[PDB]
Amino acid sequence: NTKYNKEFLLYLAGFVDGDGSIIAQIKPNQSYKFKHQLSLTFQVTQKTQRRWFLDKLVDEIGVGYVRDRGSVSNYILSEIKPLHNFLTQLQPFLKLKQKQANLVLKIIEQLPSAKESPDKFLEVCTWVDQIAALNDSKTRKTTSETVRAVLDA
Amino acid sequence: NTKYNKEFLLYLAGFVDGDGSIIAQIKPNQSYKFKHQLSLTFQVTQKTQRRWFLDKLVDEIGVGYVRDRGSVSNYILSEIKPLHNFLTQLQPFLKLKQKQANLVLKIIEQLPSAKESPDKFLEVCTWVDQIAALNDSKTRKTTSETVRAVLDAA
DNA sequence: TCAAAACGTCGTACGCAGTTTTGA
DNA sequence: TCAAAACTGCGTACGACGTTTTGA
Ligand SMILES: [Mg+2]
Ligand SMILES: [Mg+2]
Ligand SMILES: [Mg+2]
Ligand SMILES: [Mg+2]
């Protein structure tokens, strides 16, 4: 568990509000108790030509990794506990994605508890709905309603 | 000249490297002594639904305006003199657009002496070439060489 | 199972210009 | 003539998902 330079957090919050993405998903996966994975992702996108910038993120955040996909690359942070540490420090400086940040911090904390009750899990699922509401969501499919519509069994 | 708070500059540089644009142009306009205007623009683009963000920049930078062209909006800063003050304090915190900014800054300084000479005017136009090379330029037409092949017809 | 990684899809929301006009 | 504003075109570089696989 590490602490970040505030001047680095400020700059990064601006960049994240620009080209970053704080993403929460419900993934239809039969292998899970409630037939769905709760997925949290922090991501920063950039033209692969500027992959060096993303490399620096990995170095400076100390965790996460870069993935290439043709012309575009992504810094990706998915691991729940480093995500929590990082987002908790970033969140106060975000202006466009602060709500998304806080909802994710929230979702994370309620995660053991959500693996117990079919309707605690659905509650966390609605928090995910809120995150996508705040984002410029366009191709979403699996909402919280498609989750209770499955628990109908 | 207004001096900006460092925390504001830091966040903003990050946002500018994300969704901003530092733009230099050679505009074919025959009302100009060399048949072209040197145009410098600092721009921040955003979905109009989030206009408030851009409108706050107007408050915080204390100059510039916002225009809405349908689904997106822009904060625009063109006035050469506040542009210089602003980009001077912002530039140390930029990481992707630092070069563009420093280039725009010295285009501004040499702008009077470029009124003087067609040669000094072409040198300056070279700097505009460099700004566009550093950007993700895709639809450029008028270059420093377009200017040369027009100053020759004389 | 589950956290996490891997791999693909899709519609913009940006960026980066162009052209033309204003108003002394 | 000029600084500056106004208006327009266009091709991504992003954003924000989906679907499937890993590896104990
Ligand atoms: Mg953006
Ligand atoms: Mg929305
Ligand atoms: Mg960008
Ligand atoms: Mg380039």
PDB file of all heavy atoms in Angstrom, chain C residues 1-2 7 18-19 22-24, chain D residues 1-2 6-7 18 23-24:
ATOM      1  O5'  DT C   1     -17.762 -23.230  -8.515  1.00  0.00           O
ATOM      2  C5'  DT C   1     -18.341 -21.921  -8.511  1.00  0.00           C
ATOM      3  C4'  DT C   1     -17.694 -21.048  -7.449  1.00  0.00           C
ATOM      4  O4'  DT C   1     -16.266 -21.310  -7.412  1.00  0.00           O
ATOM      5  C3'  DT C   1     -17.813 -19.554  -7.696  1.00  0.00           C
ATOM      6  O3'  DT C   1     -17.705 -18.834  -6.454  1.00  0.00           O
ATOM      7  C2'  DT C   1     -16.624 -19.292  -8.622  1.00  0.00           C
ATOM      8  C1'  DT C   1     -15.565 -20.287  -8.111  1.00  0.00           C
ATOM      9  N1   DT C   1     -14.718 -20.924  -9.217  1.00  0.00           N
ATOM     10  C2   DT C   1     -13.324 -20.991  -9.092  1.00  0.00           C
ATOM     11  O2   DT C   1     -12.698 -20.574  -8.122  1.00  0.00           O
ATOM     12  N3   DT C   1     -12.687 -21.591 -10.145  1.00  0.00           N
ATOM     13  C4   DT C   1     -13.269 -22.097 -11.287  1.00  0.00           C
ATOM     14  O4   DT C   1     -12.607 -22.605 -12.203  1.00  0.00           O
ATOM     15  C5   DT C   1     -14.700 -21.984 -11.357  1.00  0.00           C
ATOM     16  C7   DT C   1     -15.420 -22.508 -12.561  1.00  0.00           C
ATOM     17  C6   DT C   1     -15.350 -21.413 -10.331  1.00  0.00           C
ATOM     18  P    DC C   2     -18.334 -17.356  -6.300  1.00  0.00           P
ATOM     19  OP1  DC C   2     -18.694 -17.161  -4.876  1.00  0.00           O
ATOM     20  OP2  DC C   2     -19.312 -17.119  -7.400  1.00  0.00           O
ATOM     21  O5'  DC C   2     -17.080 -16.407  -6.517  1.00  0.00           O
ATOM     22  C5'  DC C   2     -15.896 -16.645  -5.784  1.00  0.00           C
ATOM     23  C4'  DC C   2     -14.686 -16.160  -6.562  1.00  0.00           C
ATOM     24  O4'  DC C   2     -14.348 -17.105  -7.595  1.00  0.00           O
ATOM     25  C3'  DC C   2     -14.878 -14.840  -7.304  1.00  0.00           C
ATOM     26  O3'  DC C   2     -14.428 -13.758  -6.468  1.00  0.00           O
ATOM     27  C2'  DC C   2     -14.034 -15.015  -8.600  1.00  0.00           C
ATOM     28  C1'  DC C   2     -13.487 -16.453  -8.483  1.00  0.00           C
ATOM     29  N1   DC C   2     -13.424 -17.243  -9.780  1.00  0.00           N
ATOM     30  C2   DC C   2     -12.188 -17.748 -10.201  1.00  0.00           C
ATOM     31  O2   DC C   2     -11.183 -17.524  -9.509  1.00  0.00           O
ATOM     32  N3   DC C   2     -12.115 -18.457 -11.355  1.00  0.00           N
ATOM     33  C4   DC C   2     -13.223 -18.675 -12.078  1.00  0.00           C
ATOM     34  N4   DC C   2     -13.099 -19.386 -13.217  1.00  0.00           N
ATOM     35  C5   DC C   2     -14.504 -18.166 -11.668  1.00  0.00           C
ATOM     36  C6   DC C   2     -14.553 -17.460 -10.520  1.00  0.00           C
ATOM     37  P    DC C   7      -4.717 -12.271 -26.172  1.00  0.00           P
ATOM     38  OP1  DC C   7      -4.090 -13.413 -26.870  1.00  0.00           O
ATOM     39  OP2  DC C   7      -3.984 -10.992 -26.023  1.00  0.00           O
ATOM     40  O5'  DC C   7      -6.112 -11.973 -26.874  1.00  0.00           O
ATOM     41  C5'  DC C   7      -7.091 -12.999 -26.928  1.00  0.00           C
ATOM     42  C4'  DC C   7      -8.418 -12.436 -27.385  1.00  0.00           C
ATOM     43  O4'  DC C   7      -9.002 -11.642 -26.315  1.00  0.00           O
ATOM     44  C3'  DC C   7      -8.334 -11.509 -28.609  1.00  0.00           C
ATOM     45  O3'  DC C   7      -9.187 -12.010 -29.660  1.00  0.00           O
ATOM     46  C2'  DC C   7      -8.798 -10.141 -28.067  1.00  0.00           C
ATOM     47  C1'  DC C   7      -9.667 -10.550 -26.890  1.00  0.00           C
ATOM     48  N1   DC C   7      -9.856  -9.466 -25.839  1.00  0.00           N
ATOM     49  C2   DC C   7     -11.158  -9.061 -25.490  1.00  0.00           C
ATOM     50  O2   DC C   7     -12.126  -9.593 -26.044  1.00  0.00           O
ATOM     51  N3   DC C   7     -11.322  -8.095 -24.557  1.00  0.00           N
ATOM     52  C4   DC C   7     -10.259  -7.527 -23.985  1.00  0.00           C
ATOM     53  N4   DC C   7     -10.482  -6.566 -23.071  1.00  0.00           N
ATOM     54  C5   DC C   7      -8.920  -7.916 -24.327  1.00  0.00           C
ATOM     55  C6   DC C   7      -8.769  -8.882 -25.253  1.00  0.00           C
ATOM     56  P    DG C  18      -5.326  24.315 -42.440  1.00  0.00           P
ATOM     57  OP1  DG C  18      -4.354  24.084 -43.535  1.00  0.00           O
ATOM     58  OP2  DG C  18      -5.110  25.470 -41.530  1.00  0.00           O
ATOM     59  O5'  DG C  18      -6.798  24.360 -43.038  1.00  0.00           O
ATOM     60  C5'  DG C  18      -7.140  23.524 -44.128  1.00  0.00           C
ATOM     61  C4'  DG C  18      -8.584  23.742 -44.496  1.00  0.00           C
ATOM     62  O4'  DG C  18      -9.355  23.660 -43.292  1.00  0.00           O
ATOM     63  C3'  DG C  18      -8.878  25.112 -45.081  1.00  0.00           C
ATOM     64  O3'  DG C  18      -8.950  25.027 -46.502  1.00  0.00           O
ATOM     65  C2'  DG C  18     -10.240  25.492 -44.508  1.00  0.00           C
ATOM     66  C1'  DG C  18     -10.400  24.608 -43.297  1.00  0.00           C
ATOM     67  N9   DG C  18     -10.370  25.333 -42.038  1.00  0.00           N
ATOM     68  C8   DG C  18      -9.288  25.517 -41.218  1.00  0.00           C
ATOM     69  N7   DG C  18      -9.571  26.186 -40.138  1.00  0.00           N
ATOM     70  C5   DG C  18     -10.933  26.462 -40.254  1.00  0.00           C
ATOM     71  C6   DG C  18     -11.802  27.162 -39.386  1.00  0.00           C
ATOM     72  O6   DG C  18     -11.542  27.688 -38.297  1.00  0.00           O
ATOM     73  N1   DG C  18     -13.093  27.215 -39.886  1.00  0.00           N
ATOM     74  C2   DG C  18     -13.491  26.666 -41.076  1.00  0.00           C
ATOM     75  N2   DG C  18     -14.778  26.812 -41.389  1.00  0.00           N
ATOM     76  N3   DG C  18     -12.690  26.005 -41.894  1.00  0.00           N
ATOM     77  C4   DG C  18     -11.431  25.945 -41.422  1.00  0.00           C
ATOM     78  P    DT C  19      -8.870  26.361 -47.402  1.00  0.00           P
ATOM     79  OP1  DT C  19      -9.038  25.895 -48.800  1.00  0.00           O
ATOM     80  OP2  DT C  19      -7.695  27.148 -46.942  1.00  0.00           O
ATOM     81  O5'  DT C  19     -10.179  27.191 -47.023  1.00  0.00           O
ATOM     82  C5'  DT C  19     -11.448  26.699 -47.410  1.00  0.00           C
ATOM     83  C4'  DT C  19     -12.535  27.590 -46.862  1.00  0.00           C
ATOM     84  O4'  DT C  19     -12.393  27.699 -45.429  1.00  0.00           O
ATOM     85  C3'  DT C  19     -12.511  29.023 -47.395  1.00  0.00           C
ATOM     86  O3'  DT C  19     -13.674  29.252 -48.162  1.00  0.00           O
ATOM     87  C2'  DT C  19     -12.479  29.905 -46.134  1.00  0.00           C
ATOM     88  C1'  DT C  19     -12.902  28.940 -45.030  1.00  0.00           C
ATOM     89  N1   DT C  19     -12.313  29.282 -43.700  1.00  0.00           N
ATOM     90  C2   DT C  19     -13.118  29.782 -42.692  1.00  0.00           C
ATOM     91  O2   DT C  19     -14.315  29.953 -42.802  1.00  0.00           O
ATOM     92  N3   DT C  19     -12.466  30.067 -41.530  1.00  0.00           N
ATOM     93  C4   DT C  19     -11.128  29.913 -41.270  1.00  0.00           C
ATOM     94  O4   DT C  19     -10.646  30.205 -40.177  1.00  0.00           O
ATOM     95  C5   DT C  19     -10.340  29.387 -42.374  1.00  0.00           C
ATOM     96  C7   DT C  19      -8.873  29.172 -42.230  1.00  0.00           C
ATOM     97  C6   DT C  19     -10.965  29.105 -43.513  1.00  0.00           C
ATOM     98  P    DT C  22     -19.686  40.358 -42.306  1.00  0.00           P
ATOM     99  OP1  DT C  22     -21.121  40.513 -41.988  1.00  0.00           O
ATOM    100  OP2  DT C  22     -19.050  41.059 -43.454  1.00  0.00           O
ATOM    101  O5'  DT C  22     -18.869  40.746 -41.001  1.00  0.00           O
ATOM    102  C5'  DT C  22     -19.189  40.135 -39.791  1.00  0.00           C
ATOM    103  C4'  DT C  22     -18.282  40.637 -38.704  1.00  0.00           C
ATOM    104  O4'  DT C  22     -16.922  40.341 -39.051  1.00  0.00           O
ATOM    105  C3'  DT C  22     -18.332  42.143 -38.453  1.00  0.00           C
ATOM    106  O3'  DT C  22     -18.658  42.347 -37.108  1.00  0.00           O
ATOM    107  C2'  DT C  22     -16.898  42.634 -38.777  1.00  0.00           C
ATOM    108  C1'  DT C  22     -16.091  41.369 -38.566  1.00  0.00           C
ATOM    109  N1   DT C  22     -14.788  41.260 -39.318  1.00  0.00           N
ATOM    110  C2   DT C  22     -13.600  41.288 -38.626  1.00  0.00           C
ATOM    111  O2   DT C  22     -13.525  41.491 -37.430  1.00  0.00           O
ATOM    112  N3   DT C  22     -12.486  41.111 -39.393  1.00  0.00           N
ATOM    113  C4   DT C  22     -12.437  40.879 -40.752  1.00  0.00           C
ATOM    114  O4   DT C  22     -11.381  40.717 -41.348  1.00  0.00           O
ATOM    115  C5   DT C  22     -13.714  40.840 -41.417  1.00  0.00           C
ATOM    116  C7   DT C  22     -13.786  40.606 -42.898  1.00  0.00           C
ATOM    117  C6   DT C  22     -14.816  41.010 -40.675  1.00  0.00           C
ATOM    118  P    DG C  23     -19.517  43.620 -36.658  1.00  0.00           P
ATOM    119  OP1  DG C  23     -20.127  43.244 -35.361  1.00  0.00           O
ATOM    120  OP2  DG C  23     -20.374  44.028 -37.796  1.00  0.00           O
ATOM    121  O5'  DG C  23     -18.403  44.745 -36.415  1.00  0.00           O
ATOM    122  C5'  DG C  23     -17.392  44.518 -35.469  1.00  0.00           C
ATOM    123  C4'  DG C  23     -16.265  45.512 -35.639  1.00  0.00           C
ATOM    124  O4'  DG C  23     -15.304  45.028 -36.620  1.00  0.00           O
ATOM    125  C3'  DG C  23     -16.686  46.905 -36.117  1.00  0.00           C
ATOM    126  O3'  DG C  23     -16.025  47.881 -35.323  1.00  0.00           O
ATOM    127  C2'  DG C  23     -16.194  46.942 -37.569  1.00  0.00           C
ATOM    128  C1'  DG C  23     -14.935  46.103 -37.451  1.00  0.00           C
ATOM    129  N9   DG C  23     -14.470  45.555 -38.711  1.00  0.00           N
ATOM    130  C8   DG C  23     -15.215  45.320 -39.840  1.00  0.00           C
ATOM    131  N7   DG C  23     -14.519  44.803 -40.820  1.00  0.00           N
ATOM    132  C5   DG C  23     -13.232  44.691 -40.301  1.00  0.00           C
ATOM    133  C6   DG C  23     -12.051  44.212 -40.908  1.00  0.00           C
ATOM    134  O6   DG C  23     -11.915  43.770 -42.066  1.00  0.00           O
ATOM    135  N1   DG C  23     -10.950  44.271 -40.033  1.00  0.00           N
ATOM    136  C2   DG C  23     -11.008  44.761 -38.732  1.00  0.00           C
ATOM    137  N2   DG C  23      -9.852  44.750 -38.019  1.00  0.00           N
ATOM    138  N3   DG C  23     -12.124  45.220 -38.166  1.00  0.00           N
ATOM    139  C4   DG C  23     -13.187  45.148 -39.005  1.00  0.00           C
ATOM    140  P    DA C  24     -16.691  49.322 -35.089  1.00  0.00           P
ATOM    141  OP1  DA C  24     -16.337  49.720 -33.704  1.00  0.00           O
ATOM    142  OP2  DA C  24     -18.107  49.219 -35.504  1.00  0.00           O
ATOM    143  O5'  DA C  24     -15.959  50.266 -36.166  1.00  0.00           O
ATOM    144  C5'  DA C  24     -15.002  51.254 -35.743  1.00  0.00           C
ATOM    145  C4'  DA C  24     -13.685  50.615 -35.323  1.00  0.00           C
ATOM    146  O4'  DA C  24     -13.373  49.492 -36.204  1.00  0.00           O
ATOM    147  C3'  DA C  24     -12.476  51.539 -35.409  1.00  0.00           C
ATOM    148  O3'  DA C  24     -11.521  51.172 -34.412  1.00  0.00           O
ATOM    149  C2'  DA C  24     -11.958  51.244 -36.818  1.00  0.00           C
ATOM    150  C1'  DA C  24     -12.145  49.738 -36.862  1.00  0.00           C
ATOM    151  N9   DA C  24     -12.220  49.168 -38.203  1.00  0.00           N
ATOM    152  C8   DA C  24     -13.322  49.089 -39.007  1.00  0.00           C
ATOM    153  N7   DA C  24     -13.093  48.483 -40.165  1.00  0.00           N
ATOM    154  C5   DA C  24     -11.750  48.152 -40.103  1.00  0.00           C
ATOM    155  C6   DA C  24     -10.897  47.496 -41.008  1.00  0.00           C
ATOM    156  N6   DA C  24     -11.315  47.055 -42.203  1.00  0.00           N
ATOM    157  N1   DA C  24      -9.592  47.307 -40.632  1.00  0.00           N
ATOM    158  C2   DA C  24      -9.208  47.763 -39.418  1.00  0.00           C
ATOM    159  N3   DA C  24      -9.940  48.398 -38.488  1.00  0.00           N
ATOM    160  C4   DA C  24     -11.199  48.559 -38.895  1.00  0.00           C
TER     161       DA C  24
ATOM    162  O5'  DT D   1      -2.956  46.106 -46.582  1.00  0.00           O
ATOM    163  C5'  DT D   1      -3.770  46.533 -45.489  1.00  0.00           C
ATOM    164  C4'  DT D   1      -3.062  46.311 -44.159  1.00  0.00           C
ATOM    165  O4'  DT D   1      -3.962  46.658 -43.074  1.00  0.00           O
ATOM    166  C3'  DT D   1      -2.656  44.872 -43.870  1.00  0.00           C
ATOM    167  O3'  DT D   1      -1.584  44.868 -42.900  1.00  0.00           O
ATOM    168  C2'  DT D   1      -3.966  44.280 -43.320  1.00  0.00           C
ATOM    169  C1'  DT D   1      -4.615  45.490 -42.601  1.00  0.00           C
ATOM    170  N1   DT D   1      -6.118  45.631 -42.823  1.00  0.00           N
ATOM    171  C2   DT D   1      -6.923  46.213 -41.840  1.00  0.00           C
ATOM    172  O2   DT D   1      -6.499  46.642 -40.777  1.00  0.00           O
ATOM    173  N3   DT D   1      -8.264  46.281 -42.159  1.00  0.00           N
ATOM    174  C4   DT D   1      -8.862  45.822 -43.315  1.00  0.00           C
ATOM    175  O4   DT D   1     -10.076  45.913 -43.516  1.00  0.00           O
ATOM    176  C5   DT D   1      -7.972  45.228 -44.282  1.00  0.00           C
ATOM    177  C7   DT D   1      -8.524  44.708 -45.571  1.00  0.00           C
ATOM    178  C6   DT D   1      -6.661  45.163 -43.994  1.00  0.00           C
ATOM    179  P    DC D   2      -0.854  43.504 -42.444  1.00  0.00           P
ATOM    180  OP1  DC D   2       0.543  43.836 -42.071  1.00  0.00           O
ATOM    181  OP2  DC D   2      -1.117  42.472 -43.476  1.00  0.00           O
ATOM    182  O5'  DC D   2      -1.628  43.131 -41.090  1.00  0.00           O
ATOM    183  C5'  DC D   2      -1.618  44.067 -40.003  1.00  0.00           C
ATOM    184  C4'  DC D   2      -2.765  43.819 -39.035  1.00  0.00           C
ATOM    185  O4'  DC D   2      -4.026  44.069 -39.685  1.00  0.00           O
ATOM    186  C3'  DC D   2      -2.879  42.396 -38.517  1.00  0.00           C
ATOM    187  O3'  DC D   2      -2.120  42.255 -37.284  1.00  0.00           O
ATOM    188  C2'  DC D   2      -4.401  42.203 -38.310  1.00  0.00           C
ATOM    189  C1'  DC D   2      -5.032  43.464 -38.923  1.00  0.00           C
ATOM    190  N1   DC D   2      -6.235  43.223 -39.821  1.00  0.00           N
ATOM    191  C2   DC D   2      -7.510  43.669 -39.417  1.00  0.00           C
ATOM    192  O2   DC D   2      -7.644  44.221 -38.305  1.00  0.00           O
ATOM    193  N3   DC D   2      -8.571  43.472 -40.240  1.00  0.00           N
ATOM    194  C4   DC D   2      -8.393  42.873 -41.421  1.00  0.00           C
ATOM    195  N4   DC D   2      -9.474  42.705 -42.207  1.00  0.00           N
ATOM    196  C5   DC D   2      -7.106  42.419 -41.850  1.00  0.00           C
ATOM    197  C6   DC D   2      -6.067  42.620 -41.029  1.00  0.00           C
ATOM    198  P    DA D   6     -18.125  35.665 -32.122  1.00  0.00           P
ATOM    199  OP1  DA D   6     -19.292  36.527 -31.816  1.00  0.00           O
ATOM    200  OP2  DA D   6     -17.701  34.647 -31.150  1.00  0.00           O
ATOM    201  O5'  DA D   6     -18.423  34.969 -33.513  1.00  0.00           O
ATOM    202  C5'  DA D   6     -18.464  35.745 -34.672  1.00  0.00           C
ATOM    203  C4'  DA D   6     -18.656  34.864 -35.887  1.00  0.00           C
ATOM    204  O4'  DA D   6     -17.370  34.425 -36.387  1.00  0.00           O
ATOM    205  C3'  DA D   6     -19.482  33.599 -35.655  1.00  0.00           C
ATOM    206  O3'  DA D   6     -20.606  33.617 -36.546  1.00  0.00           O
ATOM    207  C2'  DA D   6     -18.499  32.450 -35.975  1.00  0.00           C
ATOM    208  C1'  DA D   6     -17.500  33.134 -36.897  1.00  0.00           C
ATOM    209  N9   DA D   6     -16.160  32.542 -36.918  1.00  0.00           N
ATOM    210  C8   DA D   6     -15.298  32.393 -35.855  1.00  0.00           C
ATOM    211  N7   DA D   6     -14.140  31.861 -36.179  1.00  0.00           N
ATOM    212  C5   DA D   6     -14.241  31.657 -37.551  1.00  0.00           C
ATOM    213  C6   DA D   6     -13.343  31.107 -38.503  1.00  0.00           C
ATOM    214  N6   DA D   6     -12.124  30.667 -38.181  1.00  0.00           N
ATOM    215  N1   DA D   6     -13.756  31.035 -39.808  1.00  0.00           N
ATOM    216  C2   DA D   6     -14.990  31.482 -40.118  1.00  0.00           C
ATOM    217  N3   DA D   6     -15.921  32.019 -39.304  1.00  0.00           N
ATOM    218  C4   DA D   6     -15.477  32.081 -38.025  1.00  0.00           C
ATOM    219  P    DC D   7     -21.802  32.549 -36.416  1.00  0.00           P
ATOM    220  OP1  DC D   7     -23.025  33.223 -36.892  1.00  0.00           O
ATOM    221  OP2  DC D   7     -21.774  31.930 -35.069  1.00  0.00           O
ATOM    222  O5'  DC D   7     -21.422  31.456 -37.514  1.00  0.00           O
ATOM    223  C5'  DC D   7     -20.977  31.888 -38.804  1.00  0.00           C
ATOM    224  C4'  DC D   7     -20.371  30.734 -39.585  1.00  0.00           C
ATOM    225  O4'  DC D   7     -18.972  30.567 -39.235  1.00  0.00           O
ATOM    226  C3'  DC D   7     -21.040  29.373 -39.353  1.00  0.00           C
ATOM    227  O3'  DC D   7     -21.562  28.897 -40.601  1.00  0.00           O
ATOM    228  C2'  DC D   7     -19.910  28.480 -38.796  1.00  0.00           C
ATOM    229  C1'  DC D   7     -18.658  29.198 -39.281  1.00  0.00           C
ATOM    230  N1   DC D   7     -17.432  28.958 -38.444  1.00  0.00           N
ATOM    231  C2   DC D   7     -16.281  28.475 -39.059  1.00  0.00           C
ATOM    232  O2   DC D   7     -16.308  28.247 -40.266  1.00  0.00           O
ATOM    233  N3   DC D   7     -15.165  28.266 -38.314  1.00  0.00           N
ATOM    234  C4   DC D   7     -15.182  28.514 -37.010  1.00  0.00           C
ATOM    235  N4   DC D   7     -14.062  28.284 -36.324  1.00  0.00           N
ATOM    236  C5   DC D   7     -16.348  29.014 -36.353  1.00  0.00           C
ATOM    237  C6   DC D   7     -17.444  29.221 -37.104  1.00  0.00           C
ATOM    238  P    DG D  18     -21.747  -4.451 -21.094  1.00  0.00           P
ATOM    239  OP1  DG D  18     -23.212  -4.592 -20.921  1.00  0.00           O
ATOM    240  OP2  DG D  18     -20.839  -4.801 -19.967  1.00  0.00           O
ATOM    241  O5'  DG D  18     -21.239  -5.259 -22.385  1.00  0.00           O
ATOM    242  C5'  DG D  18     -21.917  -5.148 -23.626  1.00  0.00           C
ATOM    243  C4'  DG D  18     -21.373  -6.171 -24.618  1.00  0.00           C
ATOM    244  O4'  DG D  18     -19.987  -5.869 -24.903  1.00  0.00           O
ATOM    245  C3'  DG D  18     -21.426  -7.619 -24.131  1.00  0.00           C
ATOM    246  O3'  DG D  18     -22.128  -8.444 -25.039  1.00  0.00           O
ATOM    247  C2'  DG D  18     -19.980  -8.071 -24.021  1.00  0.00           C
ATOM    248  C1'  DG D  18     -19.174  -7.011 -24.749  1.00  0.00           C
ATOM    249  N9   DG D  18     -17.992  -6.657 -23.971  1.00  0.00           N
ATOM    250  C8   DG D  18     -17.968  -5.963 -22.789  1.00  0.00           C
ATOM    251  N7   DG D  18     -16.772  -5.849 -22.281  1.00  0.00           N
ATOM    252  C5   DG D  18     -15.959  -6.534 -23.170  1.00  0.00           C
ATOM    253  C6   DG D  18     -14.562  -6.740 -23.147  1.00  0.00           C
ATOM    254  O6   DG D  18     -13.744  -6.341 -22.305  1.00  0.00           O
ATOM    255  N1   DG D  18     -14.130  -7.497 -24.235  1.00  0.00           N
ATOM    256  C2   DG D  18     -14.948  -7.980 -25.229  1.00  0.00           C
ATOM    257  N2   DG D  18     -14.346  -8.679 -26.200  1.00  0.00           N
ATOM    258  N3   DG D  18     -16.269  -7.785 -25.270  1.00  0.00           N
ATOM    259  C4   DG D  18     -16.699  -7.055 -24.206  1.00  0.00           C
ATOM    260  P    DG D  23      -2.784 -19.825 -17.851  1.00  0.00           P
ATOM    261  OP1  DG D  23      -1.551 -19.043 -18.115  1.00  0.00           O
ATOM    262  OP2  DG D  23      -3.027 -21.095 -18.579  1.00  0.00           O
ATOM    263  O5'  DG D  23      -2.890 -20.102 -16.284  1.00  0.00           O
ATOM    264  C5'  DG D  23      -3.154 -19.030 -15.407  1.00  0.00           C
ATOM    265  C4'  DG D  23      -3.397 -19.552 -14.010  1.00  0.00           C
ATOM    266  O4'  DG D  23      -4.818 -19.495 -13.704  1.00  0.00           O
ATOM    267  C3'  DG D  23      -2.988 -21.006 -13.814  1.00  0.00           C
ATOM    268  O3'  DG D  23      -2.475 -21.191 -12.511  1.00  0.00           O
ATOM    269  C2'  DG D  23      -4.296 -21.757 -14.011  1.00  0.00           C
ATOM    270  C1'  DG D  23      -5.277 -20.787 -13.373  1.00  0.00           C
ATOM    271  N9   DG D  23      -6.631 -20.950 -13.869  1.00  0.00           N
ATOM    272  C8   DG D  23      -7.021 -21.689 -14.964  1.00  0.00           C
ATOM    273  N7   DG D  23      -8.313 -21.674 -15.164  1.00  0.00           N
ATOM    274  C5   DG D  23      -8.807 -20.879 -14.132  1.00  0.00           C
ATOM    275  C6   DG D  23     -10.136 -20.519 -13.839  1.00  0.00           C
ATOM    276  O6   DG D  23     -11.162 -20.841 -14.464  1.00  0.00           O
ATOM    277  N1   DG D  23     -10.222 -19.706 -12.689  1.00  0.00           N
ATOM    278  C2   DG D  23      -9.128 -19.301 -11.927  1.00  0.00           C
ATOM    279  N2   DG D  23      -9.393 -18.513 -10.853  1.00  0.00           N
ATOM    280  N3   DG D  23      -7.862 -19.643 -12.209  1.00  0.00           N
ATOM    281  C4   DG D  23      -7.786 -20.431 -13.319  1.00  0.00           C
ATOM    282  P    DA D  24      -1.321 -22.282 -12.260  1.00  0.00           P
ATOM    283  OP1  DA D  24       0.000 -21.625 -12.383  1.00  0.00           O
ATOM    284  OP2  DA D  24      -1.647 -23.472 -13.086  1.00  0.00           O
ATOM    285  O5'  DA D  24      -1.526 -22.682 -10.740  1.00  0.00           O
ATOM    286  C5'  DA D  24      -2.807 -23.077 -10.297  1.00  0.00           C
ATOM    287  C4'  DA D  24      -3.239 -22.218  -9.129  1.00  0.00           C
ATOM    288  O4'  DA D  24      -4.494 -21.573  -9.447  1.00  0.00           O
ATOM    289  C3'  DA D  24      -3.499 -22.980  -7.839  1.00  0.00           C
ATOM    290  O3'  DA D  24      -3.346 -22.112  -6.714  1.00  0.00           O
ATOM    291  C2'  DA D  24      -4.952 -23.421  -8.018  1.00  0.00           C
ATOM    292  C1'  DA D  24      -5.560 -22.242  -8.788  1.00  0.00           C
ATOM    293  N9   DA D  24      -6.542 -22.649  -9.792  1.00  0.00           N
ATOM    294  C8   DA D  24      -6.316 -23.364 -10.939  1.00  0.00           C
ATOM    295  N7   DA D  24      -7.403 -23.580 -11.657  1.00  0.00           N
ATOM    296  C5   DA D  24      -8.400 -22.963 -10.929  1.00  0.00           C
ATOM    297  C6   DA D  24      -9.774 -22.844 -11.136  1.00  0.00           C
ATOM    298  N6   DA D  24     -10.399 -23.361 -12.212  1.00  0.00           N
ATOM    299  N1   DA D  24     -10.492 -22.155 -10.200  1.00  0.00           N
ATOM    300  C2   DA D  24      -9.843 -21.646  -9.126  1.00  0.00           C
ATOM    301  N3   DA D  24      -8.545 -21.709  -8.831  1.00  0.00           N
ATOM    302  C4   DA D  24      -7.882 -22.383  -9.770  1.00  0.00           C
TER     303       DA D  24
END
